[PDB]
């Protein structure tokens with residue numbers, strides 16, 4: 010397994026616009042289109058992002074293209090972030106995937122704010138890290154997703170995903 014497969018599990022795949030748990034227009038594999046409440050504005054963001062008049066519908070290949078752009082942006086966001094980079098360097102492969110997952114879902118700045126969790130992760134205090142990670146709006150907004158990611162940070166294995 011790898012970051013792409015991991016995220017594909019967590020985000021799913023939608024070919025039409027839907028709203029995320031924040032009520033924001035999204036499409037494909039967790040691609041946020043805009044925070045605007047206007048569906049029309051969201052449809053235009055989609056056309057802009059895809060490069061054609063989509064009438065609000067994309068193909069699987071288009072979804073995957075947005076996905077590749079998004080994972081790339083998440084990884085670059087971590088590598089250029091003073092708080093995230095050092096931690097990412099210290100992590101093993103599987104745990105690095107969990108970090109990329111968090112950034113993909115809530116952004117570089119939002120994850121960089123998990124100050125205590127990041128400290129515990131850099132110190133390989135996995136049990137403590139897991140507990141600190143749950144002290145967050147994230148743990149409550151998307152519980153099952155946050156649990157899979159947290160459990161991954163604790164075990165350093167793909168077990169939370171392979172079961173599925």
Ligand SMILES: *SCC1=CC(C)(C)N(O)C1(C)C
Pocket residue numbers: 052053054056057
């Ligand atoms: S849907 C029309 C539209 C609006 C804006 C975001 C300015 N565009 O890029 C297009 C041409 C998609």
